[PDB]
Amino acid sequence: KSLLQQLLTE
Amino acid sequence: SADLRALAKHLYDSYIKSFPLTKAKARAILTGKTTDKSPFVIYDMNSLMMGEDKIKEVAIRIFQGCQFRSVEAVQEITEYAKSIPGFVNLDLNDQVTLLKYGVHEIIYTMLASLMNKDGVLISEGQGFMTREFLKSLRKPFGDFMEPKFEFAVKFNALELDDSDLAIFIAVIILSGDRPGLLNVKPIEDIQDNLLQALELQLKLNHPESSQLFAKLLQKMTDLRQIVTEHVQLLQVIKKTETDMSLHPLLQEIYKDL
Ligand SMILES: COc1ccc2c(c[n+](C)c3c4cc5c(cc4ccc23)OCO5)c1OC
């Protein structure tokens, strides 16, 4: 759900 | 000492990779010391219409252009935070929390790099919006930017360069006092090291600037008041301004805050 979380694992 | 300079250089190199528009490139544009450009100047409604192609009532369209630039900045700052040694090994929820509560302080910091007392570079340096024009927007829109201009003029008088800013931004992101952090100690340990690198950077790069380090610590306090004040203004906007709606990334950041 978190957008920041997906950004951080790219 | 040598380890502190290698950390400082690593952070500068990542900063250059993460942020396409640096303070050095921006002051060139602002002072007109560049070859390409110039930026299109937006100083009234007529020049706003003309400059539109770079890149709903006016206050609104402007406010909603700022969201997308803030959204791009969040992404660049995220990329930058992942280069700070130790940061990607932190609990992933703590990374999210550090960026959530830290990204606006960093945005306001780096926005000073694009400002002088007369206005602000926008669209990756392709436009310049005057301070006067922005204050002439209807309440409460005329007030968003002014306290950022007031911050930036005093911040800019410190004369930091990109090398200084890289470490200063990293210190701010590694703040162990953000709400809901699960494991504070590893974050303060990293920040303790970034603080010592910052101190040595200021000593060597600004040898005649007495107490510069103490002055930047105080700017970190001032950033928190700026962000508090900005959140209040946003609150007032949710309470009126009918159609308005944050970008989903901003909604995440603002959720609670
Ligand atoms: C991250 O870089 C940024 C980030 C935010 C902004 C920005 C420039 N402007 C004009 C605004 C802005 C202008 C406004 C406003 C709200 C605003 C909110 C943010 C920005 O409401 C009244 O007019 C910018 O410059 C390159």
Author numbering:
A (entry chain B): 1432 to 1441
B (entry chain A): 208 to 262, 275 to 476
Quote the passages of the study that discuss this structure, keeping the authors' original sentences.
Peroxisome proliferator-activated receptor gamma (PPARγ, NR1C3), a member of the NR family, is highly expressed in adipose tissues and plays an indispensable role in adipocyte differentiation. Nuclear receptors (NRs) are crucial transcriptional factors controlling gene expression that function as regulative proteins that bind to specific sequences of the corresponding response elements in the vicinity of their target genes. When binding to PPARγ LBD, agonists induce coactivator recruitment and corepressor dissociation, whereas antagonists behave in the opposite way. In this study, we present comprehensive structural and functional evidence for identification chelerythrine as a selective PPARγ modulator that potently inhibited CDK5-mediated phosphorylation of PPARγ.
To further understand the molecular mechanism underlying chelerythrine interaction with PPARγ, we solved the crystal structure of PPARγ complexed with chelerythrine at a resolution of 1.98 Å. The structure reveals that chelerythrine bound PPARγ LBD adopts a classical three-layer helical sandwich structure, which is globally the same as almost all NR LBDs. As a selective modulator with weaker transactivity, chelerythrine exhibits a nearly flat scaffold that is structurally distinct from rosiglitazone. Both ligands docking in a similar binding site in the PPARγ LBP, whereas the two small molecules orient in a perpendicular manner. Chelerythrine is docked in the LBP mainly through reversible hydrophobic interactions and water-mediated contacts. First, the carbonyl oxygen of the amide from Ile326 makes a hydrogen bond contact with methoxy in chelerythrine through H2O molecule. On the other side, the nitrogen or carbonyl oxygen of an amide from Leu353, Phe360 and Met364 make additional hydrogen bond contacting to the oxygen of heterocyclic chelerythrine through H2O molecule. Rosiglitazone forms a hydrogen bond with Tyr473 and His449 through its nitrogen and oxygen atom in TZD group, which further allows helix 12 to dock against helix 3 and helix 11. However, this strong correlation is absent in the PPARγ/chelerythrine complex, which is the direct evidence of the partial agonism of chelerythrine. As a result, the hydrophobic benzene ring side chain of Phe363 shifts externally from its rosiglitazone-bound conformation, driving the side chain of Leu452 outward even as the major conformation of helix 11 is conserved as in PPARγ/rosiglitazone.
